[PDB]
Design a protein around this nucleic acid. Structure first.
Ligand SMILES: [K+]
Ligand SMILES: [K+]
Ligand SMILES: [K+]
Ligand SMILES: [K+]
Ligand SMILES: [K+]
Ligand SMILES: [K+]
Ligand SMILES: [K+]
Ligand SMILES: [K+]
Ligand SMILES: [K+]
Ligand SMILES: [K+]
Ligand SMILES: [K+]
Ligand SMILES: [K+]
Ligand SMILES: [K+]
Ligand SMILES: [K+]
Ligand SMILES: [Mg+2]
Ligand SMILES: [Mg+2]
Ligand SMILES: [Mg+2]
Ligand SMILES: [Mg+2]
Ligand SMILES: [Mg+2]
Ligand SMILES: [Mg+2]
Ligand SMILES: [Mg+2]
Ligand SMILES: [Mg+2]
Ligand SMILES: [Mg+2]
Ligand SMILES: [Mg+2]
Ligand SMILES: [Mg+2]
Ligand SMILES: [Mg+2]
Ligand SMILES: [Mg+2]
Ligand SMILES: [Mg+2]
Ligand SMILES: [Mg+2]
Ligand SMILES: [Mg+2]
Ligand SMILES: [Mg+2]
Ligand SMILES: [Mg+2]
Ligand SMILES: [Mg+2]
Ligand SMILES: [Mg+2]
Ligand SMILES: [Mg+2]
Ligand SMILES: [Mg+2]
Ligand SMILES: [Mg+2]
Ligand SMILES: [Mg+2]
Ligand SMILES: [Mg+2]
Ligand SMILES: [Mg+2]
Ligand SMILES: [Mg+2]
Ligand SMILES: [Mg+2]
Ligand SMILES: [Mg+2]
Ligand SMILES: [Mg+2]
Ligand SMILES: [Mg+2]
Ligand SMILES: [Mg+2]
Ligand SMILES: [Mg+2]
Ligand SMILES: [Mg+2]
Ligand SMILES: [Mg+2]
Ligand SMILES: [Mg+2]
Ligand SMILES: [Mg+2]
Ligand SMILES: [Mg+2]
Ligand SMILES: [Mg+2]
Ligand SMILES: [Mg+2]
Ligand SMILES: [Mg+2]
Ligand SMILES: [Mg+2]
Lengths: 118, 205, 244, 124, 97, 51, 152
RNA sequence: GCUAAACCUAGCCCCAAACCCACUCCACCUUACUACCAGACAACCUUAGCCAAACCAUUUACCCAAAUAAAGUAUAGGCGAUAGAAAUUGAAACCUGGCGCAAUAGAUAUAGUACCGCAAGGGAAAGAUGAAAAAUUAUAACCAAGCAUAAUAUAGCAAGGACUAACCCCUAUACCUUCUGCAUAAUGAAUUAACUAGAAAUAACUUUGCAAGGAGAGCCAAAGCUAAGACCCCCGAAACCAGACGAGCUACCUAAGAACAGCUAAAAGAGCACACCCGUCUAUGUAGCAAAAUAGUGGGAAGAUUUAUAGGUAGAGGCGACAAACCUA
RNA sequence: CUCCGCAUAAGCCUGCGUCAGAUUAAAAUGAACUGACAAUUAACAGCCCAAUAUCUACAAUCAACCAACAAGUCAUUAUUACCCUCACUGUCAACCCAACACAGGCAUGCUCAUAAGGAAAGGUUAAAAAAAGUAAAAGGAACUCGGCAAAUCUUACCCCG
RNA sequence: CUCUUACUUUUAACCAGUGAAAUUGACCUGCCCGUGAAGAGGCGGGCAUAACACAGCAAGACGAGAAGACCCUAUGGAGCUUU
């Protein structure tokens, strides 16, 4: 392509312009309404027991009449607690190896550069 | 975009080049080079800055810094610490020999004082206006950041606006008047569109 | 690795942060309390020490409760602390005979009671024990109001309590609207169980029912920032005028 | 022998599967009896394209321009620029009350509007 | 095959660093300190091993009652299995009775 | 049984290094003479005629 | 628009309008022979033929008689060095026919004459190589490989 | 001389400390990742068994909220195996370290990926220049088995004694295991490299300390007491139980479909005979074309027939024109 | 030669199109392997329907004679409500299930011998043994457990069911 | 079948290209008689004996393959039946 940078420049300008307009609309929504999100939602627990932000959809009938929405479950039963702990312990092991590894690199980084004691 | 493996080894050739791809394929895994951690603020060597070589084949020589590689704390100076390599070779023709420079660590070079052409050590400081600068320890004098041509290559002092380049008087003109209307509402009033139908309420869940 | 806190303390760590930390104090105290229930399916020793017949020494003795399984249909009635006993037995009461699974169930009846504070009749399922406990308290209202939670062992019995305590605090005139004197006489008999409305509205609620309640007390559309800045402006202008 | 690690698409499955699955295109109508599709003119997005005649701005900007700093717009910044001047004038005039806040520009509700802010009912 | 062709990098050891020059200090903190402190209190490490010694079955039993309520589920399950295996080996298997 | 040779080599040009690079090749000597010199014919004879 | 929520419509409601559309289309050269009036485009999946018409008429002022679309599968056959399949993105193709008898032929965007530079180009490095390459000559067979540099 | 060999990092392990815990837009419980329509299904319930008791049948330790001590004491128990308290006593506590691994090790991990499996689930392998590769006609060589340089000459566990001399002469029944006893024609082993297996109380002995006292509360003591040292392996069944996953094969069933030429007789769970279904006998094949096939010959072929599609019955079971059939070789 | 072939369903998912190639098949033109580029365009098909009440005894078989049992796959009305209309998706191939570029398995329509689709022989020699076939003097089951196999186109009887 | 024979194809063997599997303690791997864990290429006494490929054969290597399914043992299992 002759000048590929041309496309990168336009894409950056199209994104900057979309940032400005959305910035003016967000500020105008905080003044009239006070909401930080343009789309409604809520914090809920899924069938798996993990926290998730539910983004609402547009419907014509209330939620207590909808066949398909009421088949969806937003609550976890007691057989999930053990898996939540097993998944928490999995993240802790990862975070521990990451922290102990960084300490090792720093301890090995003084053997070759011993003037970093300060 | 950027696709660098976890332990990608930076080198003289820029990333993503055909030479770097052949040198650093996605699959290879090499021992990571150890680099002394230096704060971006503390780094005091920039392109276009004279430096004196302390250790090497040709020590005591001063040369301009053409390239700097922060990842490996390398400084490249033109015409110094240079070996020879045949370029443009072919199967029939041996090729042309050229001197190729080798990178130098930030500890193997030493900045020179503009007043006296001797190696000196510098420590950052602040001037009256507040702009941060680097000052020599011995015979403290200011050492400004040498002007270096931009990477893209554009020279502002030699720019000619084209047919698709907005003018300075049209790109800096202020036309915005803070109001309490959205682009949608403000545009429908100017374009002349009218919509009397109302939007019936929906349920959100 | 190891956890900073033991796992059995994780449930009480959830009551220190979040919306549960914003719950009333008296309600949170009633949750951590683990008072012992009254013995039903076993006899207590009565004392702390006894003399073992074999050696004739003063040995210590402890009362170990028997696990009771309460089915879900027990929370729609008043069983009086009774439940199913899931255990084993020895055939012919012989230790050398094989061991079998045995379940003891209680005898249930469908009776009809009347509450004087609520002026309404309920058709609850009960046991013979519940009928005797209502006769020792001299009415259903005293039984529901005297008996604690760990002895009632019923969600419906704890919801009646909340219903009664709310009328003793609000002094609801809906009770016999056309008989003021009669109404006043009823509230003068249960005056020893009067609890402030603020504290009587959280009685019996579970952790899941209370969180939902507290959430509704905090649910309110966010205040627009247009009003906040006007207050700061006007308040700021007034201060400026004084300096002038 | 099935690829369970491949993107499920309308190209896979029997005839009934391939017709029911789509690609993300929004609907513009409904199906009536006889498998007859009815298009709704109000469901089709109408492009609001402006007149570009005599428009100074161009895709690019000359490099001979200053390096102005970025000042992200905030709600407080928009209030002081547009709403505050009108309030200060009326405050000095001596006629200011909360009841007239709607006259200053405040919107008590979003109902009865074509472009509501929350939940917004318009496209970018 | 199986033996390196070059010599390894020299093994340089500083015999006069802080940890080696001050090793053994305060081991008689009790004898010379009026017995206010005990040398076992200078030991650092697992809280179930400070000033205590035992075999694997004794170590595993001690760890389970001291920090077992804080252990990860998978690690605790393996500890219980290890105690079961060791209980059978030491109490049922061997040359001597 | 699916292992193969790691043969992925491709042939590129060495005439010029990567483009759009601020660093450039620095040359110390020129390629050829700026003005060609042609020694006059008979200069070999003048070798004897030193004067 | 794509990656946005569409406001739901009910009987008697306002017309749906998009003021800024993020649909970006690229005109392509047909691989096989097509009629003169026909034009070929590559459009995003979420885009419909009805939108492409109004999109072309409004933004580019092009009258279109007919529009047809097809979804083209991208091969998931390629595998990396880890034997993991690489997916070529599936894309949508649109065939547009002009209205009033207009004919469109894809232009030659890379003319060889324009590509060739009339103005002399004198890259320093290339000049160095070319000069030296020409000056040096092949070894004379009669010399037998004896170094030629020596004048003796 | 080839094939190869060699490397030191990636990271990992055990502790300590600290409680832990998201986000661009859009999509995702229906066939998940699918913009848009009348619903009301809802969670809780003793683990068992292997094993030990040399069978087995009562019984057989499994953190449960403070280290030590009281104490393996009271007590329980086919009073067997074994199990087993409390009262009471009452200690310490500074994350940033390692007589831990270094590519068959250490996490399975370059990755829960490739690959296998309908599914639950199972589950890898590997890398190595240099300051610079914008120095790649580069970083020397020397080392396993296997080959090549370089096939072989009567006769024999292949060698040993020797000899001027390789062989010729003389002497000599491989190794491990297992057995009364093996050259045994009894077991295992193509070979190279790496990996691959003895863990501890009681008492006693030996060497120090102190000594009718010893020991840094507990305990022992009629020379004892304290401390130390030094003794108890590896791989392997058929099984048993719990909880998940399976009727796209097959067995039977449900819903709604499809196919069956021609001839005879025209009535057919009728006959001849294609398609189609089955698999009688023979040969071939036996690490194959095929983990049940090929060729020919045969049985049935308008019926209790064959067959596509979706659904149902699940292991203490199902299904069965009972062959102990079949329920993913 | 023609064991077929073309198409649909199902399944699979770019898997012999162009350019290039150091990759590849027995084969250093070809290519199903690698890299890049291109490609399947709806009329066929899929994706349907406002409510309440109400209606629906008389098979099919050329459906007419006729004869049946196993007794069968097709239907409405009343009132109310209802003027915008052609979107979305499938469309390629030498292809699926059998670890394979497997002599196996695989529903339907048409073709019923083809207008479609294919190649048993790498070259030579012409030993044994072995495999698959053809012909055979005279005799004709003497073979063998047995007329197995092959040839030929045949009688009678018994046991069991 | 007496009683086999001839020809064709496949296989076959030779040339070229591509290129598996079980197996394998090491082997410089003969015969007779005798001996012996009772059936010897390997021990004793005799006989034989330059080295070497290819094609055939199946007497032996107690030939290869599957830790015998028959039999017995195990205080090892399971299915079925039962006064
Ligand atoms: K033991
Ligand atoms: K047993
Ligand atoms: K591994
Ligand atoms: K033997
Ligand atoms: K044997
Ligand atoms: K042997
Ligand atoms: K052995
Ligand atoms: K089924
Ligand atoms: K496919
Ligand atoms: K086959
Ligand atoms: K043909
Ligand atoms: K003949
Ligand atoms: K033989
Ligand atoms: K054998
Ligand atoms: Mg289409
Ligand atoms: Mg036993
Ligand atoms: Mg105690
Ligand atoms: Mg590993
Ligand atoms: Mg060797
Ligand atoms: Mg000899
Ligand atoms: Mg041995
Ligand atoms: Mg024997
Ligand atoms: Mg012997
Ligand atoms: Mg032998
Ligand atoms: Mg044996
Ligand atoms: Mg030991
Ligand atoms: Mg048992
Ligand atoms: Mg079971
Ligand atoms: Mg089925
Ligand atoms: Mg089937
Ligand atoms: Mg049926
Ligand atoms: Mg017929
Ligand atoms: Mg028949
Ligand atoms: Mg028949
Ligand atoms: Mg059957
Ligand atoms: Mg039978
Ligand atoms: Mg039988
Ligand atoms: Mg149609
Ligand atoms: Mg087609
Ligand atoms: Mg052929
Ligand atoms: Mg041949
Ligand atoms: Mg022959
Ligand atoms: Mg004859
Ligand atoms: Mg005979
Ligand atoms: Mg006869
Ligand atoms: Mg005979
Ligand atoms: Mg026959
Ligand atoms: Mg019969
Ligand atoms: Mg050959
Ligand atoms: Mg063997
Ligand atoms: Mg013999
Ligand atoms: Mg031979
Ligand atoms: Mg043979
Ligand atoms: Mg055996
Ligand atoms: Mg037994
Ligand atoms: Mg047993």
């Amino acid at each position: 392509m002759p000048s590929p940078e041309r496309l990168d420049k336009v894409v950056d300008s199209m994104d900057a312009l979309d940032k400005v307009v959305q910035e003016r609309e967000d500020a105008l929504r905080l003044l009239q309404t006070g909401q930080e999100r343009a789309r409604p939602g809520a914090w809920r627990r899924d069938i798996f027991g993990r926290i998730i932000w539910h983004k609402f959809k547009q419907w014509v009938i209330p939620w207590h009449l909808n066949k398909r929405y009421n088949r969806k479950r937003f609550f976890a039963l007691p057989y999930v607690d053990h898996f939540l702990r097993l998944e928490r312990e999995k993240r802790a092991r990862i975070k521990a190896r990451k922290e102990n590894l960084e300490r090792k690199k720093a301890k090995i980084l003084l053997k070759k550069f011993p003037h970093l004691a300060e | 975009k950027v696709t660098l493996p976890p332990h990608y080894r930076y080198g003289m050739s820029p990333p993503g080049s055909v030479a770097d791809k052949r040198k650093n394929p996605p699959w290879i895994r090499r021992r990571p080079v150890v680099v002394e951690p230096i704060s971006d603020e503390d780094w005091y060597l920039f392109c276009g800055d004279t430096v004196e070589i302390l250790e090497g084949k040709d020590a005591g020589k001063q040369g301009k810094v053409v390239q700097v590689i922060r990842q490996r704390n390398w400084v490249v100076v033109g015409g110094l610490n240079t070996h020879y390599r045949y370029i443009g070779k072919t199967m029939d023709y041996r090729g042309t020999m050229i001197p190729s420079e080798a990178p130098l660590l930030h500890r193997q070079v030493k900045l020179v004082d503009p007043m006296d052409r001797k190696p000196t050590e510098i420590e950052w400081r602040f001037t009256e206006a507040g702009e941060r600068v680097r000052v020599s320890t011995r015979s403290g004098r200011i050492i400004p950041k040498p002007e270096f041509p931009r990477a893209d290559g554009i020279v502002p002092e030699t720019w000619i606006d084209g047919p698709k380049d907005t003018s300075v008087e049209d790109a800096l003109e202020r036309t915005y008047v803070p109001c309490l209307k959205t682009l949608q509402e403000e545009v429908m009033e100017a374009m002349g569109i009218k919509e009397t139908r109302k939007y019936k309420k929906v349920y959100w869940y | 690795p190891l956890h900073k806190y033991p796992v059995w303390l994780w449930k009480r760590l959830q009551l220190r942060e979040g919306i549960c930390s914003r719950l009333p104090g008296h309600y949170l105290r009633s949750l951590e309390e683990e008072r012992t229930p009254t013995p039903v399916h076993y006899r207590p020793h009565g004392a702390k020490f006894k003399i073992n017949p074999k050696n004739g020494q003063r040995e210590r003795v402890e009362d170990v409760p028997i696990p009771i399984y309460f089915p879900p249909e027990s929370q729609r009635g008043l069983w009086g602390g009774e439940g199913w006993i899931l255990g084993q037995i020895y055939a012919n009461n012989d230790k050398l005979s094989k061991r079998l699974k045995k379940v003891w169930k209680p005898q249930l009846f469908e009776r009809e009671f009347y509450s004087e504070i609520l002026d309404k009749k309920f058709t609850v399922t009960v046991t013979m024990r519940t009928l005797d406990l209502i006769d020792e308290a001299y009415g259903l209202d005293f039984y529901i109001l005297k008996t604690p939670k760990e002895d009632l062992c019923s969600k419906f019995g704890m919801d009646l309590k909340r219903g009664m305590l709310l009328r003793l605090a609000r002094q609801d005139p809906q009770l016999h609207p056309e008989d003021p004197e009669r109404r006043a006489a009823i509230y003068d008999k249960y005056k020893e169980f009067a609890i402030p409305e603020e504290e009587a509205e959280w009685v019996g609620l579970t952790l899941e029912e209370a969180i939902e309640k507290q959430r509704l007390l905090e649910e309110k559309d966010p205040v627009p920032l247009f009003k906040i800045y006007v207050a700061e402006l006007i308040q700021q202008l007034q201060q400026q005028a004084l300096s002038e | 022998g099935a690829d369970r690690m491949s993107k499920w698409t309308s190209k896979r499955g029997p005839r009934s599967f391939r017709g029911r699955k789509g690609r993300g295109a929004k609907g513009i109508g409904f199906l009536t009896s006889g498998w007859r599709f009815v298009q709704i003119k109000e469901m089709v997005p109408e492009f609001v394209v402006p007149d570009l005649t005599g428009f100074k701005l161009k895709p690019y900007v000359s490099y001979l321009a200053p390096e102005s700093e970025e000042t992200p717009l905030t709600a407080a910044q928009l209030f002081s620029e547009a709403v505050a001047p009108a309030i200060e004038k009326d405050f000095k005039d001596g006629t200011f009350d909360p009841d007239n806040l709607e006259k200053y520009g405040f919107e008590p509700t979003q109902e009865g509007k074509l472009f509501q802010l929350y939940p917004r009912n318009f496209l970018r | 095959i199986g033996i390196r062709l070059t010599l390894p990098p020299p093994k340089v050891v500083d015999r006069w660093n802080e940890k080696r020059a001050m090793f053994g200090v305060y081991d008689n903190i009790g004898i010379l300190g009026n017995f206010e402190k005990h040398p076992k209190e200078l030991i650092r490490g697992p809280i179930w091993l400070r000033g205590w010694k035992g075999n694997e079955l004794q170590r595993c039993i001690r760890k389970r009652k001291m920090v077992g309520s804080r252990m990860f589920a998978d690690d605790l399950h393996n500890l219980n299995k290890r105690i079961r295996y060791l209980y059978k080996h030491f109490n049922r298997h061997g040359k001597f009775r | 049984t699916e292992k193969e040779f790691m043969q992925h080599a491709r042939k590129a040009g060495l005439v010029i290094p990567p483009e759009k690079s601020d660093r450039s090749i620095h040359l110390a000597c020129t390629a050829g003479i700026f003005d060609a010199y042609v020694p006059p014919e008979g200069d070999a004879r003048i070798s004897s005629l030193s004067k | 628009a794509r990656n946005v929520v569409y406001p739901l419509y009910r009987l008697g409601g306002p017309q749906l309008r998009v003021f800024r559309t993020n649909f970006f289309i690229q005109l392509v050269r047909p691989g096989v022979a097509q009629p003169e009036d026909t034009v070929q485009f590559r459009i995003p999946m979420e885009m419909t033929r009805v939108d492409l018409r109004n999109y072309l008429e409004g933004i580019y002022n092009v009258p279109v008689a007919a529009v047809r679309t097809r979804v083209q599968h991208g091969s998931n056959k390629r595998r990396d060095h880890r034997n993991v399949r690489i997916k070529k993105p599936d894309y949508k193709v649109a065939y547009v026919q002009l209205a009033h008898g207009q004919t469109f032929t894809f232009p030659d965007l890379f003319p060889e004459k324009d590509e060739s530079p009339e103005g002399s180009a004198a890259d320093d490095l290339y000049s160095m190589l070319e000069e030296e390459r020409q000056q040096r000559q092949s070894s004379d067979p009669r010399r037998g490989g004896v170094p030629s540099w020596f004048g003796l």
